[PDB]
Amino acid sequence: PTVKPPTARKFIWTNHKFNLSGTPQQYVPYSTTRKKIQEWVPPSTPYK
Amino acid sequence: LGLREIRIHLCQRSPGSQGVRDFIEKRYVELKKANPDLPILIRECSDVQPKLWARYAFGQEKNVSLNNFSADQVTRALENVLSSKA
Amino acid sequence: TQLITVDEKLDITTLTGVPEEHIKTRKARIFVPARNNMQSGVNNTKKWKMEFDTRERWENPLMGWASTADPLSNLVLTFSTKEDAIAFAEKNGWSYDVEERKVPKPKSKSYGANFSWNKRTRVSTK
Amino acid sequence: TRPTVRPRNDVAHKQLSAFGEYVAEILPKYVQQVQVSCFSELEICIHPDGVIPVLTFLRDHSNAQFKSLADLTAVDIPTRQNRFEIVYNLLSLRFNSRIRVKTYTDELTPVESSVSVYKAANWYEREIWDMFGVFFANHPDLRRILTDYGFEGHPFRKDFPLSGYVELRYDDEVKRVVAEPVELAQEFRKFDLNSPWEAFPAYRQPPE
Amino acid sequence: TSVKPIFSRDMNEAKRRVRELYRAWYREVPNTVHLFQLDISVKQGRDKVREMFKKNAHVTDPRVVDLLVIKGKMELEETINVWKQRTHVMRFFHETEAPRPKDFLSKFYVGHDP
Amino acid sequence: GVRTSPTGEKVTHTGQVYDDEDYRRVRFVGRQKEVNENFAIDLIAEQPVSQVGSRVISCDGGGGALGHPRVYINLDKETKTGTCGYCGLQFRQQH
Amino acid sequence: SNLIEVFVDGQSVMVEPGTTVLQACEKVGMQIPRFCYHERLSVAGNCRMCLVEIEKAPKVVAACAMPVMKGWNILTNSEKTKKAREGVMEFLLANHPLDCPICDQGGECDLQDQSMMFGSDRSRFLEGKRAVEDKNIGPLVKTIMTRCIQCTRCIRFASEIAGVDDLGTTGRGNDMQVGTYIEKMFMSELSGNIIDICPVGALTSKPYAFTARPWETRKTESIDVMDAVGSNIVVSTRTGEVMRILPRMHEDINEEWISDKTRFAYDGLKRQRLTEPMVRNEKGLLTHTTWEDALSRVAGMLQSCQGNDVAAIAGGLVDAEALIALKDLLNRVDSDTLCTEEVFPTAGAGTDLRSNYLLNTTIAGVEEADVVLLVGTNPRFEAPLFNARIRKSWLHNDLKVALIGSPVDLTYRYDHLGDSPKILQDIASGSHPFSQVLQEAKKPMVVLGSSALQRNDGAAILAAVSNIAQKIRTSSGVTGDWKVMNILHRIASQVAALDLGYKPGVEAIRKNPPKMLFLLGADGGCVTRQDLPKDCFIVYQGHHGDVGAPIADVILPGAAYTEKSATYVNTEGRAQQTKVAVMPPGLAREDWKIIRALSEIAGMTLPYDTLDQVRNRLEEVSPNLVRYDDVEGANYFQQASELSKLVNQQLLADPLVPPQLTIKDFYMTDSISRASQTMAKCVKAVTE
Ligand code: SF4
Ligand code: SF4
Ligand code: FES
Ligand SMILES: [K+]
Ligand SMILES: [Zn+2]
């Protein structure tokens, strides 16, 4: 790469990181979708 | 305590319901003129046997087969239901 | 002669190894699949399909995936005629329902009807 | 049709048709159909009761000499009453040829075992049992060969689901590997990939 | 309606074979309990054998009961020789799974399963 | 252009966040929630609209075979720009 | 017979005179490729894909428009037929944009499938493609006119079936574009069906946009409950979530079209749901609880009730199993006060005979009628597929239609007799010309809407219309197998409730108010807490909390129509069953299961535990509810006519006005549509 540098991009990481397994900075999976079924909210006033 | 509804099941094309059919165009209307507050549901189907369901108070139901009955037998059975009130 | 007579109905449910829960509590639907309305092809409506009812699919707590506990969810069987499907359902002891095949009625098409003299079937544009 | 189309072998087609007529003429008691495919493969569909003589003929006739048993297969087609189709593939080294013999059985009819003709079938058809429940009469040692020891049901039947009915996990309370009903974290996504337009006009079936 | 029999021409020979298979399993059960070091008693194993035999006791076709006797014989030979482990013998005793609801109300409470 | 939920959790580009009463947040205790800080919509919003002098324009994303399939965009509407369906680039007719 | 003999690939086949080549090939079993042909539209013959070769004829003919001649040999697999198909595919794909990954028609595109089957495999087009400006026709149909192939199914559908005449081809040559030419939206009650008939991805469903893909969706065949037509639909789901709704082919009801509410109520089906049982706490607010506590509270309240102290109101989206379970539960207490929100006149024959509350002919009988009279209804919005059938018979069979009521737009020309009910009294007396028109009709048809029976003088209207039907039935030229008296319903659960013996209307409850009320999805607001006594124990059981939920004491979350196998009866008496597409969300259960568990808690157990046992009970009450896709004939019109002459009621002076006058009031009718964002967008786009 000193002879042929890579193409510069605005989103390419400027700080490479090694493997983070076993560390607090590891990766935890989760669902990226939102809620599917909306639940009905009962009214806050009594029927009286 | 008393009957609450009457159901008459029959067929439009089967011959065994014919006497039951002979009831409906002959003695039904005056019957409806005798018990105006009694639901008498007439239901037809493609191949059902003739039948008479009688619902009483608190869900008790009795069944009377009307197969190959004449019109006079049909109204005799119907008067038995109307005068039973069991 | 080496042949014996058995007149009882076929019943192989004890040999298939399927648990009884998926034998007596399942409803098998035998049907000709409907044509997809987004296409005009009719090649998918030539054979009878037998399938089962749909049970519960819920969400995985980890990734939100579709988890199930029904093993017969992806089972679809293909039969040439209705009677083969009925015989296969009765042999395996599955309670079944069958719906008749719906074919399109033959229409009457005429290109000249777009240019009628006194009928309402004139086209406003072509 | 030169570069991208597979060339035909007409002489092999003629020879296989002649030999099929020869076999169907020698044994009219058992054979039911003789066909040759477009890529020159000979299939002889016979009655199941002649599964022992016919193979023996193909093992011993001087014009056949099908000494090798290449394969033994069962095919499950639920739309037929005889849902199991049993396929024997034979190879003749003397004449450098291959033949296929097909019989039909259902779940309850037993089959005469072809161990006395070909010894390799002693495992092959046994596997068929372990995958299909097709009983082979007069087999020396018939049992399961691929499934687990407590396995119930025959997996290669088309009414058997992809995942089974049980699955294994280790339980620390009983200190044992135990079986429980299957609960998949991801359901197997079934894909309907069949196009609604007819692809091959030559294989079009007559209507009803 | 004439079919090729497997072993028995009628129901009598099939019932005879069922009797032999039950006799062999009843003789086998104490040896299975002692050899595999199971935590069950001989009474529990014999009651389990009787439970399977009564569970599979509503058939009337000679070929079906013939195949059932054949499969029971295969399981018996898998138990006679040490091919099954402790786990395969204890597959018949479902201890780990929770007992499923039976009445309408509990099945209504737990989910949508009929 | 990331934002921070009042519970202290980062919101992803899909809008996903865990509620305060959700127990699944216990999977992030002692670890970190992995989010991408480069939002594609924000990054494509900064791209200037290219002015061209033709009725239709062709887009392939640049690089030829390294881009998307080539598409043709009509620029007759003077009110709004013509956005590419793949790359999101927009064009405008200068007349 | 007058059949002629033609040949397809050397195989002989008899056809009727006037049959096209395409229809003969379909008869022998061969599907000729097509783009512009549609069996429910007029023949255009412009796509030129159906070009086939007749033997000993040196010119290919368009099979979609060419009538067969005697002795013609059709060669569907010949060399020049395949050459013509390849050339037409090349011309069609010359200007098509490379949009398949970003197009919703991918995986179910007709153009893709016929390009794979009958087309070539490479392109010779080295020039530049055209680009078409996109159009806007409303928030229902997403429009990408660059993908259009100018097949002109748009204009044919909008002119022959929808009856709108707002689409057209503007321009000439390669610049010809399909559109409205102005900033106009295509808002009809059957607009979304164009998304079904576009063979390319030019017109797509805007709510469905970029959500799923056809190969990964599971199809469940179910029945629509948005109206009383009973349209057969396919629910396409994906991983336990409903994605879209498509029509099903059924030649007797909804041939291949559905209304827009049916196609776009699913997004409201997945909103504002009831998931857990709720009870009133010490503060008077509805808080979540278990099934045991709520069912114990309801059973403890019901056990103290007897006689007429407990009643029930059935909603519009209730299955027959729930209705019979609630009827048996209330009859175990000896309560006959089971009511429905929709009002039907019970005077005279009542719900005894099935002839006087059914569409007695068929849906398809409009194709056989010659004079149709519509009384006090707007069939365009109350039952849009019935209006489509009437329009089809008007276009093809030269039907004559007259209407009594408000002069609504019905997408065909009719004879507006007036809006007063008194003109009906003129029809039976013969003082009107339309009395002579009905007398001279061979197959007359009188349709009375169920919305006209909601008035206080509904019994008098029904008596007058039945008098007209019996006057023009026995005296005029009616064969006897033809049924004249027809009632069009607008509620999916009304016919099944009337078959089971429910009391129509809520007047029985207003007569003597009960101290405990059951609301089986009663979101119509017919009975409020003002009419009920001071301490009324209202129990609500439904899938959506819209109107009846905030006034209830205990809320029992039920299942929707896509979440259970449920029996519904349409307006012509044909029983049908739905299938389980997805499962109910949260702790929501099936309705009859809820009622059976409630009877189990109270010690009054109903004698059924599984679904088939409830269906056997349904057969016991009325057998025609268990025969599916079968229309049992109704009889004894004369007996109902004789019974209707007993009690004389007078018509009111108010003119007949339907509740749905424009397309604005069509989109929101039930609780599912009122909780829908797509319906809100449609109403906003209409009103602006
Ligand atoms: S309409 Fe068909 S051919 Fe055109 S982009 Fe969509 S999938 Fe491709
Ligand atoms: S938009 Fe679709 S249906 Fe309309 S003319 Fe074009 S290809 Fe045909
Ligand atoms: S289908 Fe005949 S020309 Fe289009
Ligand atoms: K489309
Ligand atoms: Zn681009």
Characterize the structure shown.
The structure is cut from a larger assembly and holds 7 protein chains of 7 kinds. Chain B is of the alpha+beta class. Chain B contains 3 helices and 4 strands. In chain B, helix 1 packs across helix 3. Chain D has 208 residues and is an alpha/beta fold. Chain D is 19% helix and 26% strand. In chain D, the strands form 3 sheets. A 5-stranded mixed β-sheet of chain D has the order 1-2-5-4-3. Chain D has a two-stranded parallel sheet with strand order 6-7. With 95 residues, chain F is mainly β. Chain F has a domain of 54 residues: Sandwich (HSP40/DNAj peptide-binding domain), CATH 2.60.260. In chain F, the strands form 3 sheets. A 3-stranded mixed β-sheet of chain F has the order 3-7-6, with no helix packed on it. In chain F, strand 1 and strand 2 form a beta hairpin. Chains in contact: A-C, A-F, A-G, B-G, C-D, C-E, C-G, D-E, D-G, E-G, F-G. The interface between E and G is small, with 6 and 14 residues. The site of one iron/sulfur cluster (SF4) has 12 residues of chain G, from helix 3. Chain D: Core subunit of respiratory chain NADH dehydrogenase (Complex I) which is composed of 45 different subunits. Interacts with NDUFAF3. Interacts with RAB5IF. Found in subcomplexes containing subunits NDUFS2, MT-ND1 and NDUFA13.
* Proportion in β-strands of chain F: 15-25%
Distance between the termini of chain D: 35 Å
- How many E-type strands of chain D? 9
Largest sheet of chain F: 3 strands, mixed
N→C terminal distance of chain F: 35 Å
PDB class: proton transport
Keywords: respiration, iron-sulphur cluster
Entry title: Complex I from Ovis aries at pH5.5, Open state
Chain A: NADH dehydrogenase [ubiquinone] 1 alpha subcomplex subunit 12
Which SSEs are present, and which pair or pack?
The structure is cut from a larger assembly and holds seven protein chains of seven kinds.
Chain A: no helix or strand
Chain B: E1 3-11, H1 18-24, H2 28-32, E2 40-45, E3 51-56, E4 61-65, H3 71-84
Parallel strand pairs in B: 1-2
Antiparallel strand pairs in B: 1-3, 3-4
Chain E: E1 2-3, H1 11-35, H2 42-55, H3 62-80, H4 86-89, H5 104-110
Helix pairs in contact in E: 1-2, 1-3
Bound molecules: iron/sulfur cluster (SF4) (2 copies), FE2/S2 (inorganic) cluster, potassium ion (K) and zinc ion.
PDB class: proton transport
Keywords: Complex I, respiration, NADH, proton pump, mitochondria, iron-sulphur cluster, oxidoreductase, membrane protein, Quinone, proton transport
Entry title: Complex I from Ovis aries at pH5.5, Open state
Task: List the keywords.
part of a larger assembly, 7 chains, B: 86 residues, alpha+beta, 4-stranded mixed sheet, G: 688 residues, alpha/beta, 7-stranded mixed sheet, 5-stranded mixed sheet, binds iron/sulfur cluster, binds FE2/S2 (inorganic) cluster
